[PDB]
Design a protein around this ligand. Sequence first.
Ligand code: CLA
Ligand code: CLA
Ligand code: CLA
Ligand code: KC1
Ligand code: KC1
Ligand code: KC1
Ligand SMILES: CC1=C(C#C/C(C)=C/C=C/C(C)=C/C=C/C=C(C)/C=C/C=C(C)/C=C/[C@@]23O[C@]2(C)C[C@@H](O)CC3(C)C)C(C)(C)C[C@H](O)C1
Lengths: 160, 162, 215, 160
Amino acid sequence: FENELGVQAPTGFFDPLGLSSDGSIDNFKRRRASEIKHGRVAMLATMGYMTPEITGKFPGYLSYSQSIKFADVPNGLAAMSKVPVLGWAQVAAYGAVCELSQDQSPGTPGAAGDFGFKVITSEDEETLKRKLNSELANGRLAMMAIIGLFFQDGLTGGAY
Amino acid sequence: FENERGVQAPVGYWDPLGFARDGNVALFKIRRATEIKHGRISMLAAMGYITPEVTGKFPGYLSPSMGLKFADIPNGLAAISKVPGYGWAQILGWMAFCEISVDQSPGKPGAAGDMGFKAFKVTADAPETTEKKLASELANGRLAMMAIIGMFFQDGLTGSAW
Amino acid sequence: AHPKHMLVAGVRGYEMEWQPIPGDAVKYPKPNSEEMFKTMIGADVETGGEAWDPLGFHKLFDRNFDFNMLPVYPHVQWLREAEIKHGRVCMLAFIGCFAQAGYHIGSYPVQPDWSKALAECYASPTGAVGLFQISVLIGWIEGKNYNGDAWVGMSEKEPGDLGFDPAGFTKNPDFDLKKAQLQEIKNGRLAMVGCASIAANHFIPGSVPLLTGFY
Amino acid sequence: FESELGAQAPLGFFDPLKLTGDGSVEAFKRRRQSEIKHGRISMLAAMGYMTPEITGKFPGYLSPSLNLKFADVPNGLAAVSKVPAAGWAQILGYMAYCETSQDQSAGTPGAAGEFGFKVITSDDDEVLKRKLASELANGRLAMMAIIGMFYQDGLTGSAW
Ligand code: CLA
Ligand code: CLA
Ligand code: CLA
Ligand code: KC1
Ligand code: KC1
Ligand code: KC1
Ligand SMILES: CC1=C(C#C/C(C)=C/C=C/C(C)=C/C=C/C=C(C)/C=C/C=C(C)/C=C/[C@@]23O[C@]2(C)C[C@@H](O)CC3(C)C)C(C)(C)C[C@H](O)C1
């Protein structure tokens, strides 16, 4: 399996044991959807780890009923136990309307990261290649940095 | 009936009384199955007497709730009261499962001693080695039957195990 | 015979109908049931190698045509679907019963006892939201795999065939899926027996002589 | 029966009383299956009975609910009554999966220890035979070693 937007500059078909059968195109398509979704979520999560620190936490409350404030929710893994769980349920609802609105069954465009977002799309198939591989490489670096920040918060006891 | 297993070197076809000796092949099959099963259960009982004395009682409890601790229980015609009633029930249940899982009855392979227990691994296409093992099983079963009855009597008269 | 209309249930010439869901076309079920039972996964050595169904619960759907020509009793396909679902739910329930007593995850009230955790999480302001999320997720994964039509023996899917197989199973040339299905079914029955034992111990102490100290 | 594995440079065909009955190639095959299985089991047993001494007991609990630790379970024959009963049940379950997944009946790869481990292997048939004989020799040595270790643990107060 080559040409599938996965081989980059400092690396090739990086599989110490990945793609164990070196086939099973259905498994590989599922893994492609998995990796692209993981990368997008990670990029967002690292983004949201480094936004509150470099740009002060939101000015509002985030909970008028529970008297919580944005400036009172700690940044990092501790926020999961501070954000009101109705808020996490609403985040789950947004994830649902973001996952179940458009189908992502195998074969469908949803199974290839094609959720019709565009906005930062391009025009030429080579420019398409550039944008897609940029997104994928940034997502891999994201995943790495996001689990790194997870462990930094877990061990150091704070955001950094 | 003088060509079957059993009949051996020390005594030939042994029949002081009138059992068999009148044909009745089915009756002989029943008696052979009875002899084999009795010899097996006997051999097991013989070991169950010798082992708790030669080595020692098991390192455990046998009743973690009641704390019987194996070794507290004596050996022979006196564990009948010490071993918990549910323990005896489980032992008899295992024996009943061994009896009913197989189908001892006329003709079927369970009526000749083959109870599906294929340990003591003996190979096919090598008879007269399977037959020697079966004859040894019969002889050891007979010896163990007489021995276990003698051990019963020894414990009963002497008041304790051996 | 009787005209095309006026045909309901016991009238001669009335083809059996099955349309419980408003929005789905009418389905006309054949008896089957016994025919599907004769070629059905299960029936291992533990019961003699034959399909152990005393009381004839798999034949009642065939007897529907004799009773009132109505799908009152489930098809054997529905029975296998229910058995599979019960087995999976009971596996999870047994693991949960023996994991909640030692582990705690969320902001739910601390209740190691399994018989009280559900109610105490109902009462929790930050437990009701979580149980609502669990309920909506279960409802999604249950209505998506609605089966339902297995009640009349036409499910178009083998029992317990939700859209879930992250590993390579059901696709590898090896790993005979018949043995895996038999293992799943038998372990599910085992888990259901275990859950029944847990309930009996909770209500009648000393019933199962291995969970005496358990909740 | 000289050429069927074993029969290493030390001594020859060691059978003071065995295999002298009739040969019975299938009986020898069954005994070779048993020998390979016992050798693998005893190699694992010797390694796991000497490792808790070469290296400290694993860092962890092995039973968080029962508050046990890998470090407070005595090594050796004293561990049979210390490892949790469910832990022994799971170990026996993994053993049963090993013994029941692939067929081990006669005239099958499972009858010669051929299950598909394939990690220590090669392609040169001579090297394959050499490695198989090495496995058999190490297995016999481990059988005797683990029996001796068990008896040292029993007669003495602890391991070694
Ligand atoms: C349950 C007991 C039992 C049974 C059913 C059999 C059955 C058989 N034996 Mg056998 N045998 C036994 C015990 C038994 N044996 C014991 C313990 C010995 C060792 C002394 C032998 C030694 C032996 C030899 C040497 C031979 C047989 C042979 C045979 C077969 C010929 C048919 C026959 O006479 O059996 C009929 C079975 C009986 C009559 C059993 C009745 C038991 C009596 C009535 C009760 C009293 C016995 C004893 C003295 C009581 C002790 C306890 C008491 C103090 C309370 C037959 C299959 C022959 C053979 O192989 O033929 C091919 C043969 O040559 N047996
Ligand atoms: C309600 C759960 C449930 C359901 C729907 C099924 C369904 C089925 N089982 Mg099954 N089974 C279950 C639980 C269940 N099983 C449990 C817990 C065990 C362990 C004992 C078994 C053991 C088992 C075996 C060994 C076999 C089946 C077979 C079958 C199939 C035909 C039998 C039939 O029509 O019964 C469906 C109808 C019911 C099960 C009605 C259940 C309602 C009764 C009245 C409840 C009474 C139990 C009560 C609580 C007492 C508890 C007893 C204790 C042991 C727990 C069918 C697919 C056979 C098969 O595979 O055929 C190919 C077969 O050979 N089952
Ligand atoms: C599980 C045990 C086991 C088994 C099944 C085998 C099986 C085999 N070995 Mg073998 N072997 C073993 C252990 C075993 N070995 C050990 C531990 C050693 C090291 C001393 C050897 C050394 C060895 C050599 C050097 C050779 C074989 C050979 C053979 C093969 C032909 C010989 C034969 O038929 O023996 C059948 C198996 C047996 C007779 C094992 C019986 C074990 C006895 C009955 C019990 C011993 C008890 C022990 C000493 C004390 C334990 C404590 C006690 C107080 C409780 C055969 C496949 C030969 C070969 O490769 O042939 C091609 C050959 O040349 N073996
Ligand atoms: C794998 C299934 C299984 C389990 C799980 C299990 C467990 C327990 N067995 Mg059992 N067992 C078998 C199977 C199982 N036993 C089999 C096949 C046999 C061969 C016949 C057998 C033999 C005995 C005997 C002789 C005794 C015994 C007992 C207990 C006991 C203690 C409870 C208590 O005291 O707390 C517990 C927990 C002792 C007893 O005390 O029974 C009240 C007792 O004397 N068992
Ligand atoms: C990335 C977004 C995200 C976060 C960050 C997040 C976090 C938490 N989720 Mg959540 N979640 C989703 C998204 C997210 N969840 C999605 C898409 C689903 C559907 C698959 C889903 C399902 C459930 C369920 C079923 C439960 C649940 C809960 C909690 C909980 C504990 C709060 C606490 O104990 O205070 C925390 C911190 C459990 C709970 O306890 O709620 C009371 C509960 O039962 N979640
Ligand atoms: C991915 C599947 C999986 C899970 C999820 C899982 C989980 C737990 N294992 Mg387990 N396990 C395997 C698989 C899994 N184990 C496998 C393949 C083996 C090799 C045979 C194995 C071995 C042991 C042993 C030896 C013990 C053990 C235990 C526990 C335990 C503790 C519960 C508690 O005490 O909180 C929990 C939660 C200990 C025990 O006591 O269980 C009651 C213990 O002694 N496990
Ligand atoms: C933002 C935010 C939050 C958040 C968040 C979220 C959702 C964070 C998300 C984190 C996320 C998404 C973490 C997963 C990463 C995926 C990984 C690590 C995959 C690795 C996979 C690897 C390393 C595999 C590599 C392979 O080499 C192997 C092994 C075999 C090779 O052949 C093939 C390849 C190359 C593939 C909180 C926590 C809710 C509160 C906080 O306050 C605010």
